[PDB]
Amino acid sequence: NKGIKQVYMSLPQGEKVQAMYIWIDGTGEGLRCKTRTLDSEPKCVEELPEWNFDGSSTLQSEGSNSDMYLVPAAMFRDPFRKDPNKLVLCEVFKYNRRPAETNLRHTCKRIMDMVSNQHPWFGMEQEYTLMGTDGHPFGWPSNGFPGPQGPYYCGVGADRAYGRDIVEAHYRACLYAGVKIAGTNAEVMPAQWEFQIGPCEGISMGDHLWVARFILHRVCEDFGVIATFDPKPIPGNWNGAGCHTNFSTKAMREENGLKYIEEAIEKLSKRHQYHIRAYDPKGGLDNARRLTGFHETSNINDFSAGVANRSASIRIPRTVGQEKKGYFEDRRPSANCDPFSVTEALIRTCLLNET
Amino acid sequence: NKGIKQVYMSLPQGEKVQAMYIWIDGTGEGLRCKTRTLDSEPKCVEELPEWNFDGSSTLQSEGSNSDMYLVPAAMFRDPFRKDPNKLVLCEVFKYNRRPAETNLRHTCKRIMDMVSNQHPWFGMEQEYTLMGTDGHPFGWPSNGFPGPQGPYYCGVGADRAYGRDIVEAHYRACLYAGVKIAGTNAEVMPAQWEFQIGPCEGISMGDHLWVARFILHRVCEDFGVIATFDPKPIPGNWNGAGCHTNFSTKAMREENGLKYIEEAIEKLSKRHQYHIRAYDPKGGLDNARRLTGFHETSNINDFSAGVANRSASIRIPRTVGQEKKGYFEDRRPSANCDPFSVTEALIRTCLLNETG
Amino acid sequence: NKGIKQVYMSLPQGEKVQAMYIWIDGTGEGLRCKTRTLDSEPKCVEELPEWNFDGSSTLQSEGSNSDMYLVPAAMFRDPFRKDPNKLVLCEVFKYNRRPAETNLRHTCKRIMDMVSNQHPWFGMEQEYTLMGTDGHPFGWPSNGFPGPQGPYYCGVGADRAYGRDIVEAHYRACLYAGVKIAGTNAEVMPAQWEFQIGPCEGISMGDHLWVARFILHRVCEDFGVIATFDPKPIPGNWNGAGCHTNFSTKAMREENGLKYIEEAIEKLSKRHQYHIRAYDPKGGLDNARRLTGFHETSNINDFSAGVANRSASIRIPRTVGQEKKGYFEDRRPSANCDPFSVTEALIRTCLLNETG
Amino acid sequence: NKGIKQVYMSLPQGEKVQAMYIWIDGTGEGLRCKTRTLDSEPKCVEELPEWNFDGSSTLQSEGSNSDMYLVPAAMFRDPFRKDPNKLVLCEVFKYNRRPAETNLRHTCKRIMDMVSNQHPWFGMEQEYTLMGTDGHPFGWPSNGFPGPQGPYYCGVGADRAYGRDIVEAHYRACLYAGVKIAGTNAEVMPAQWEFQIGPCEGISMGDHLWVARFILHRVCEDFGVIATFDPKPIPGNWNGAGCHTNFSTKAMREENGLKYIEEAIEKLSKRHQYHIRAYDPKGGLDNARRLTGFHETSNINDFSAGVANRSASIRIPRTVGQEKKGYFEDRRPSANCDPFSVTEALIRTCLLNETG
Amino acid sequence: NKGIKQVYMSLPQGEKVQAMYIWIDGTGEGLRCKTRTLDSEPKCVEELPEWNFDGSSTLQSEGSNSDMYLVPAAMFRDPFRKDPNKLVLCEVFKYNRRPAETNLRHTCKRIMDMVSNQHPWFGMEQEYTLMGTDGHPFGWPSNGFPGPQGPYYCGVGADRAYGRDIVEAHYRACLYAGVKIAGTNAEVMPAQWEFQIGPCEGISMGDHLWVARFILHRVCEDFGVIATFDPKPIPGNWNGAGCHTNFSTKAMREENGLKYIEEAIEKLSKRHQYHIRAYDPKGGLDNARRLTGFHETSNINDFSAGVANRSASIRIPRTVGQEKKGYFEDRRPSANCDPFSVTEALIRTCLLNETG
Ligand SMILES: Nc1ncnc2c1ncn2[C@@H]1O[C@H](COP(=O)(O)OP(=O)(O)O)[C@@H](O)[C@H]1O
Ligand SMILES: Nc1ncnc2c1ncn2[C@@H]1O[C@H](COP(=O)(O)OP(=O)(O)O)[C@@H](O)[C@H]1O
Ligand SMILES: Nc1ncnc2c1ncn2[C@@H]1O[C@H](COP(=O)(O)OP(=O)(O)O)[C@@H](O)[C@H]1O
Ligand SMILES: Nc1ncnc2c1ncn2[C@@H]1O[C@H](COP(=O)(O)OP(=O)(O)O)[C@@H](O)[C@H]1O
Ligand SMILES: Nc1ncnc2c1ncn2[C@@H]1O[C@H](COP(=O)(O)OP(=O)(O)O)[C@@H](O)[C@H]1O
Ligand SMILES: C[S@](=O)(CC[C@H](N)C(=O)O)=NP(=O)(O)O
Ligand SMILES: C[S@](=O)(CC[C@H](N)C(=O)O)=NP(=O)(O)O
Ligand SMILES: C[S@](=O)(CC[C@H](N)C(=O)O)=NP(=O)(O)O
Ligand SMILES: C[S@](=O)(CC[C@H](N)C(=O)O)=NP(=O)(O)O
Ligand SMILES: C[S@](=O)(CC[C@H](N)C(=O)O)=NP(=O)(O)O
Ligand SMILES: [Cl-]
Ligand SMILES: [Cl-]
Ligand SMILES: [Cl-]
Ligand SMILES: [Cl-]
Ligand SMILES: [Cl-]
Ligand SMILES: [Mn+2]
Ligand SMILES: [Mn+2]
Ligand SMILES: [Mn+2]
Ligand SMILES: [Mn+2]
Ligand SMILES: [Mn+2]
Ligand SMILES: [Mn+2]
Ligand SMILES: [Mn+2]
Ligand SMILES: [Mn+2]
Ligand SMILES: [Mn+2]
Ligand SMILES: [Mn+2]
Ligand SMILES: [Mn+2]
Ligand SMILES: [Mn+2]
Ligand SMILES: [Mn+2]
Ligand SMILES: [Mn+2]
Ligand SMILES: [Mn+2]
């Protein structure tokens, strides 16, 4: 019970600091973490030491040659334990010092360093659904369905906003951590929510979202509920869950940048399948259950773009159409995507001209 | 659980500021909201940026041309997240920049801006009933009725004031927000309560009332209950819910302003139907279940006025009668009325002298 | 849930001030209340404005001429909302500015003003029983009885003090309110408790007791329990509940004031029925269930007085007999008496020498 | 659990027989019983032996001289244990062989023998409410009220007929027992029911009703509920419980017997209080909570008769009016009356022509 | 509990017989009943005596002239009490021996007798929904909805057939009663079922349906559920409840009866509104919530005929088309219709050739 825990957490900690290292596991979806005591507060991520873990217990190596490296990547303030304690998102490397199969950050970071003069900015909309520990969505009638979609999107009242406590707590944990949380909203399916992260330049998009995600799970853990990023948690007449990625370069944000937005969309229109394969951890099999062309989605087989069009693969927000500068929104990525794969694909297709 | 939450909400938030944008959806009764992060604290409503939402998810636009505009109208302090965070009432406009069908603030503002030298003040009494999530009123016997009306009005005791925690929390949240809450009371039906908002000049009446209604639903949300503004939530020998609108111009508040009170009433007497059509979101259908001439209502079909008379369409409070100045009370609006429609009707009829 | 509420109640409220107006309804026993926002903290009760309420919803007037006046009488600090908020006990008057039928303060006050040189002080022992919301006393076995009386009077232990949280909370609320709470004790019946208010001079007795009673009902409301002031809430072999009124004048408090105590008691002995009628709201029919001559009561039909005698109509406490000065205790008033009625009878009989 | 019991009750019993002796206790309303084993089946009430009991445990005598007599009066078949076992209604006599204070049958029987040539028949409508173990009517919302009266009289459906199982079981028990049960209906108040016993000649009315009542309390015991015969078990806007006594003599049953019916009513009109005193066990005090003139009752203070009039003290049913023969309905008796008292009074007033 | 009851119901009852009289109340939809003991088993309905009831406790007369007549119309065996016990359906008459406002049988019998030579047969399909005591359909998630319609029509399994015990019990009860039950099926909405009663000549259609309805409510009572005949019990994407009245005359059943089926469908096309007013007890307002044109209904405002067309007002079943004889199906009657009013309209329009 969390009133007991809180008494303990009030105890002055002293000169020692806790650092919780976080990594992506052998599934490409699951996050793992563990804590060490440091002698003093690190002033930045470069002062954090390297560490390691049992790769055989995360599906990433064999028991008899099991140590796998953790190398600090991004440091944040720990909103579960307060200052001076830290969260550290790490990269994983194998016994031979090569990146792990699910270390998609390594290549992504290199790609972003190469296009830094164009200052690529990303804003990702992590939709997700709150679930009871029993597998059924939070607040839903037991063995049953609430009333049809309509009243839950941005809704207020015990009869339609299910789980706001998580959202509020997460929002505040992120602000404390230093994660660039841009906003939040209740979504179309009851118990389904959203937070936006951005705009983040370069590799920091992936960094900030993954830590954002870790904070969601730890937060939910405290409330005794589960966050799912599955793109279609409830089959049938219920909305799925995406991770719309908004994107802009410097040129796109300048006066008449819409020219370049349109060039970018044109390029994406030729590399649809490649992006579908980049946009969920099962190469597109997961989005196959969301991207149906209903429930505010595009069909998985058909590329389209349009102004203010929540049925298109890419939407140009009304604002951006009017102002003729800004960003476009790629609506194809699954809620369970790896932002390093999503953001890397966008750079390769839009800035590096791969085909 | 709420204790877990409070721990997170004790964390210092830093330099960034949260702004919750609030609007009226396609039903004209539901409120919607969402939050953006800003780089610093806005010093007034004019410093808040425009925004937009998916109008196809609120019954206001089509999926494939869905964005709709949010334009800040009224800013308040957020009593759920504390300073420096904000609540922002917005007006909704369509893809073509025109007011949404349920944007009744737009016209109403213009009408208030035109009669501002007469400083119209309004006081609205929002009644509402607290409901369990099972659709049965809060504190009522499961599947059953509490004892007859009599002891609940302005009552005190666990056996008669059902839900005061909400009432107390909402009163304090409003005060902190900057909402001009004038008072509150337990009401005749058990689980039913009231807050008064006013006196508010002009367009601020609708602004304050709508934000007050938002705060109530959010407060109720924390307590795992629902507030309903339905004008007759329980049929039979149980009181309905109204939104009595108290109204005065500068002339009515001066010595012998009763003269002008009587004139406003005389004009209201000829435009009863038009007011009934303006007094709920279904043009009088919701009020048909309440305005019966019983349970301290007037009959929907009959206009009447009277001093201290809780059965008339209009009541002149005893105070006003004695002092020969003040305001009159229009007792016809439904609990679920849109105050912009209500206040605008009163201006058109009483100040702009419209007929038909 | 009360943890949620406390978060809202920690919000700084700002410049505006809440004033909870409190009055006695048409039953002469029920308390009612409602709140208004004021622009600044009032510093005397007189700075509070008159108000009014619907008398048709408290059984005191008709709906079609309904407003009834609230005139502030006594002001206290609000222990539910904190400084700068206020509780205000009021007098009720009719449409014609005459006192309500259940406004017994009006005459009482005038009677105290006639004898102010004699400085009458009162001390009232409010006994009450804590009840579950199901009508069964708090802590009692479900559908049954605890063990017999003996161990509960002034008792300590989870198995004998039922409901101390309420008592401790109310003690502190009154101290903060500025109500002159003299003490408290667990009583003979389990779930039954007592608080003493005094000594209060003149009209303040009734003011303080009524506010104490209001504060008790509000406190119980928080704990999800009911206080009953019924004089015999459980029939049979269980103590009833009275409101022992201790009384003295200047003369009685001075050296050898026992002479005047005894003179007062002789006047009381000739006016027993008149007092009984004044000592509950049903003119003696409620006390007929308590004043049995058992369970530390006198029989309703006989007058008797004695030193240290918990069976007499009047008791002279041992201390007072010994010091030959102080006060006497009238043990006849019902727990649900109206203190304005009790204190006034005492003055008329003992100081104004009335007969009738 | 009744399945366990039912297996034991399938065991064939053997040659021995069980007789449960039943009597009225010191309260005049409470029924007592105990069982003895007999060598063989009695073929009538006269082959049953006298017995006794502890009067000091039924409020009827002193511990130290306590045995009181039981003399068989009416024998019936036992529907709880089946043939060949028996229920026996007894008269109670004191140590000195005189009738007990609550043995009203002894005087009744004589009065019936004084007029047996006119063959008095009676039918009584025992109304009663089923209550939970918790003191609250069966099927009612916990701590609350079902919907208003209207749908429950002769109702069918889970949401309006509460406790038919009891009614059905009892009906069948009485028939088996040999009680002259005439019919049943659900009543106006939810969980309130009725059975009619009749028509019974003379003393057998009281005999049959008391045994009917015993069978009812027994049946209820199996189902874990209580029957109350209180005349007003829920105060306010709910029907109370009566025991309408329908009455006729041979003259009244013959052609143009209405002549004599109206004579009978004229005599009763002059002895109203006398009958109210005979019509509940507290000589009228219980009926003062029921006979209000509302809820299909007469006013306790007023005598009246009318054809088909459920507000009158006496009702001549339409059937009887049309045919000009039959009987009349005394609607004054309480649900908790002693039928020996009611039946005795009617004979004294109507047939023996007493005045006083 | 029901195990206790069944023990009692195994007691052999002896020579007396229970007759439960059943009637339609002031609502036109409510069934009432009550029971009397008879000296022997009646063999024909004509043997059963007239009776009466309190019309003032059923909304059919005033307290002070309240008796209303019951005249036995149709007799059946009682499946709740078994042979030799009877269910009797009655007609209600007023104090002045005229038909009660809701006795629609009286006129219908005269119409039926006019066309006895055309031997009119009806078959009615009583659709109904099983509800919990709590107002929510049986088996539905609590506060929630089950999965979309599709798998429930004629479904099998704990996840799609909700309440078969009721259906099976009712089927068997009707067959024992003597009610002409033609079949049953689970329906499209979960918890919604169907039973067919037919084919019944003339006035015996209404008689059989109404008793069937009684038997259903009674059976549901046993199980602690409610049956509703509301035509649209759950709003939205859920089927409503009809009472499809199939119909033929002797000409229509003979070879090439389709000729006369079509002539009758033609006469019905010109009296749509008349029939809509005849087809629910609120003159069409209830059917307004069901006859939308969706959920296998026709639009209330539109007449249509069609072979195998479940969207049509009238459906000619494939069978009847292929064989050019039989009957046609009026799909317009609400689940809560009075069969006497439905079947009367059909004879009037089709056989008596009425207009306007
Ligand atoms: N110039 C930009 N480049 C990339 N992302 C941007 C830019 N400007 C805003 N964003 C981001 O786009 C996201 C907008 O998402 P959201 O507000 O959820 O819009 P919608 O629901 O209309 O898709 C936010 O993360 C925001 O920070
Ligand atoms: N001059 C005025 N003009 C308009 N409204 C006023 C004026 N004076 C007071 N009011 C408002 O009228 C309302 C009175 O409502 P309430 O106190 O509930 O009255 P009631 O006696 O009708 O229940 C309050 O909102 C109050 O602020
Ligand atoms: N001079 C006085 N006049 C009136 N009341 C007094 C005086 N002195 C003390 N009292 C009051 O009498 C009451 C004593 O109550 P309590 O201690 O319960 O007495 P007991 O149980 O001994 O009757 C207290 O309110 C106390 O303040
Ligand atoms: N001639 C009669 N003399 C006495 N009682 C009769 C006579 N005829 C019928 N009764 C009885 O009167 C009672 C009728 O009560 P009930 O059927 O409940 O009528 P209601 O409710 O209309 O007053 C039954 O007990 C019946 O046996
Ligand atoms: N010639 C007829 N006249 C009247 N009713 C008939 C005739 N033949 C069959 N029926 C009845 O019509 C009804 C058919 O209903 P049902 O089997 O539910 O039809 P549906 O195909 O509409 O589901 C049954 O009551 C059946 O007995
Ligand atoms: C309301 S929605 O259009 C819903 C998107 C849907 N869940 C999906 O992308 O699958 N997203 P948004 O308005 O945040 O851009
Ligand atoms: C107590 S009441 O008369 C009740 C009004 C009722 N609820 C209605 O207007 O329907 N309102 P108020 O006294 O606040 O003016
Ligand atoms: C313990 S008692 O004697 C009990 C008094 C009793 N309840 C009555 O006055 O009815 N009163 P006190 O408070 O004076 O000690
Ligand atoms: C329906 S009632 O009028 C109810 C009478 C009420 N319970 C009474 O107290 O008398 N009795 P009845 O129909 O048996 O004559
Ligand atoms: C399955 S249904 O078409 C459904 C009928 C719908 N409930 C109605 O309102 O008629 N009736 P039928 O048993 O004739 O097939
Ligand atoms: Cl850890
Ligand atoms: Cl939000
Ligand atoms: Cl208040
Ligand atoms: Cl026994
Ligand atoms: Cl019955
Ligand atoms: Mn979004
Ligand atoms: Mn979204
Ligand atoms: Mn988006
Ligand atoms: Mn008010
Ligand atoms: Mn009000
Ligand atoms: Mn008002
Ligand atoms: Mn004391
Ligand atoms: Mn005491
Ligand atoms: Mn005392
Ligand atoms: Mn009866
Ligand atoms: Mn009756
Ligand atoms: Mn009767
Ligand atoms: Mn069918
Ligand atoms: Mn069907
Ligand atoms: Mn059909």
UniProtKB/Swiss-Prot annotation, chain A:
Chain residues that bind L-glutamate: 237-238, 310, 331
Classification via Pfam families: Gln-synt_C (PF00120), Gln-synt_N (PF03951)
List of residues that carry Phosphoserine: 334
Matching SUPFAM superfamilies: Glutamine synthetase, N-terminal domain, Glutamine synthetase/guanido kinase
EC code: 6.3.1.2, 2.3.1.225
Protein family membership: Belongs to the glutamine synthetase family.
Co-factor requirement: Mg(2+); Mn(2+)
Modified residues (Phosphotyrosine): 95
Organism encoding this protein: Homo sapiens
Binding annotation for Mn(2+) 1: 125, 244, 329
Membrane topology label: Lipid-anchor
Binding annotation for Mn(2+) 2: 127, 187, 194
Record-annotated GS catalytic domain positions: 104-355
Residues the entry annotates as binding ATP: 125, 194-199, 246-248, 310, 315
Principal place of residence: cytoplasm
Summary of activators and inhibitors of this protein: Glutamine synthetase activity is inhibited by methionine sulfoximine (MSO).
Description of post-translational modifications: Acetylated by EP300/p300; acetylation is stimulated by increased glutamine levels and promotes ubiquitin-mediated proteasomal degradation. Palmitoylated; undergoes autopalmitoylation.
GO cellular component, as recorded: cell body; cytoplasm; cytosol; endoplasmic reticulum; extracellular exosome; glial cell projection; mitochondrion; nucleus
Subcellular location: Cytoplasm, Cytosol; Microsome; Mitochondrion; Cell membrane
Protein's UniProt name: Glutamine synthetase
SMART domains assigned to the protein according to its UniProt record, in alphabetical order: Gln-synt_C
PANTHER family: GLUTAMINE SYNTHETASE
Gene from which the chain derives: GLUL
The GS beta-grasp domain, residue ranges: 15-97
Higher taxonomy: Eukaryota, Metazoa, Chordata, Craniata, Vertebrata
InterPro entries: Gln_synt_N (IPR008147), Gln_synt_N_sf (IPR036651), Gln_synth/guanido_kin_cat_dom (IPR014746), Gln_synth_cat_dom (IPR008146), Gln_synth_gly_rich_site (IPR027303), Gln_synth_N_conserv_site (IPR027302), Glutamine_Synthetase (IPR050292)
Disulphide connectivity of cysteines: none
Chain positions covered by the region annotation Required for glutamine-induced ubiquitination by CRL4(CRBN) and proteasomal degradation: 1-16
Function: Glutamine synthetase that catalyzes the ATP-dependent conversion of glutamate and ammonia to glutamine. Its role depends on tissue localization: in the brain, it regulates the levels of toxic ammonia and converts neurotoxic glutamate to harmless glutamine, whereas in the liver, it is one of the enzymes responsible for the removal of ammonia.
Swiss-Prot record, chains B, C, D, E:
Superkingdom of this protein's organism: Eukaryota
Transmembrane domains' residue ranges: none
Domain GS beta-grasp: 15-97
SUPFAM superfamilies found in the cross-reference section: Glutamine synthetase, N-terminal domain, Glutamine synthetase/guanido kinase
Binding of L-glutamate, residues: 237-238, 310, 331
Membrane topology: Lipid-anchor
Induction note: By glucocorticoids. Vitamin D and the Wnt signaling pathway inhibit its expression and activity. Glutamine synthase (GS) levels are regulated by a negative feedback mechanism where elevated glutamine levels stimulate GS ubiquitin-mediated proteasomal degradation.
Regulation: Glutamine synthetase activity is inhibited by methionine sulfoximine (MSO).
Region (Required for glutamine-induced ubiquitination by CRL4(CRBN) and proteasomal degradation): 1-16
Sites bearing N6-acetyllysine, chain numbering: 2, 5
Tissue: Expressed in endothelial cells.
Keyword Nucleotide-binding part of the UniProt annotation: yes
Entry EC number(s): 6.3.1.2, 2.3.1.225
Domain GS catalytic: 104-356
Documented effect of changing residue 2 to R: Decreased glutamine-induced acetylation. Decreased ubiquitination and decreased proteasomal degradation
Residues involved in Mn(2+) 2 binding: 127, 187, 194
Manganese found in the keyword field: yes
GO molecular function: ATP binding; glutamine synthetase activity; identical protein binding; metal ion binding; protein-cysteine S-palmitoyltransferase activity
One GO term (biological process): intracellular ammonium homeostasis
Positions of Mn(2+) 1 binding: 125, 244, 329
Modified how: Acetylated by EP300/p300; acetylation is stimulated by increased glutamine levels and promotes ubiquitin-mediated proteasomal degradation.
Subcellular location: Cytoplasm, Cytosol; Microsome; Mitochondrion; Cell membrane
Alphabetized PANTHER family for the sequence: GLUTAMINE SYNTHETASE
Subunit relationships: Decamer; composed of two pentamers. Interacts with PALMD. Interacts with RHOJ. Interacts with BEST2; this interaction tethers a fraction of GLUL to the membrane, causing a decrease of cytosolic glutamine synthase (GS) activity and inhibits the chloride channel activity of BEST2 by affecting the gating at the aperture in the absence of intracellular glutamate.
Involvement in disorder: Glutamine deficiency, congenital: An autosomal recessive disorder characterized by variable brain malformations, encephalopathy, severe developmental delay, seizures, and decreased glutamine levels in bodily fluids. Death in early infancy may occur. Developmental and epileptic encephalopathy 116: A form of epileptic encephalopathy, a heterogeneous group of early-onset epilepsies characterized by refractory seizures, neurodevelopmental impairment, and poor prognosis. Development is normal prior to seizure onset, after which cognitive and motor delays become apparent. DEE116 is autosomal dominant form characterized by severe developmental delay, seizures, and white matter abnormalities.
Entry protein name: Glutamine synthetase
Species: Homo sapiens
Gene that specifies this protein: GLUL
